[model samples]
Target: MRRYEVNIVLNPNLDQSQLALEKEIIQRALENYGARVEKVAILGLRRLAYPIAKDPQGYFLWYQVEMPEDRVNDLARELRIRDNVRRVMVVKSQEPFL
Candidate 1:
């Protein structure tokens, strides 16, 4: 399995537990795609450098995964279609996400 960093930008409107549930949803998707989650970090809410769909703030989450490189893109496809996800990216992680 290859190491990857999953960076996510999400709508900040969700409350603490609401955001927690979102993580579970993403985690389930990752597992379904044959990826093992190594770590999930809540990077806190922050002002967007620019607005997206008129949302001025974003919640960031970073994930470290161990999976086949090709499946990483496949896993990201789910994230793409999520209404809660403003943006998501999977990158080859030499150092990993903490």
Candidate 2:
């Protein structure tokens, strides 16, 4: 397994339940793709430098996950089918954190 940083940008208007469900969905997806989902930092709503999906702000999440390097495609595919996900960025980390 390798360290990966997943940065998810979600719709800002999502309510508490929706946000929770989204988090669950993300964790499930990661785990399914062999990730031991770690520190999930809820960065809350923040202004974007530019609009994404026509929204000027978004809910941000940072996930520190450890997963196999080869599972990228499976991970991306799962997330793509989810609703209200503004964007998902995954990057391999030279280092890691909690």
Candidate 3:
């Protein structure tokens, strides 16, 4: 399995409850796509470097995941289809020397 870091930009307008729900929803989506999520970091809302969809701020979520390299694109495809997700990036990580 290959390790990957997933970064997602979510709608900043969502309420606290909705934000929590969105986290779980994304977690489930990761597992469904054959990825095992190792860690999730709630990066919270911050000013974007530039506007997207006319929104100047965004909620960020970062995840450390492990899965087969072949299924990586599939996970990206699923996330990109979500209406609440403004941007999604999946980056492969090089394993450190043991």
Quality of model 1 by C-alpha lDDT = 0.87
Which residue ranges in model 3 land beyond 4 Å of their true spot?
94-98
lDDT tens per residue, model 1, 1-98:
89888888888998999889888899899988888999999998989888877998999988888988778777898797898898888888987655
Model 2 C-alpha RMSD to native: 1.4
Residues 1-98 of candidate 2: C-alpha lDDT, one tens digit per residue: 78888988889999889988898889888999889987898899999888887899999888998899899777976686667888788998767884
lDDT of 3 by residue, 49-84 (tens): 887779999999988898888988988898888888
Model 2, position 77: C-alpha lDDT score: 67
- Candidate 2 lDDT at 72 equals 71
Q: What RMSD, rounded to one decimal, does every model reach?
A: 1.5, 1.4, 2.4
lDDT of 2 at 20: 84
Clash counts per candidate, in order, are 0, 0, 0
| Residue pairs of candidate 1 with colliding backbone atoms | none
> What overall lDDT goes with each candidate model?
0.87, 0.86, 0.87
Runs in model 1 deviating more than 4 A are none
Q: Highest TM-score, which number?
A: 1
Name the candidate, 1 or 2, with the larger TM-score value.
1
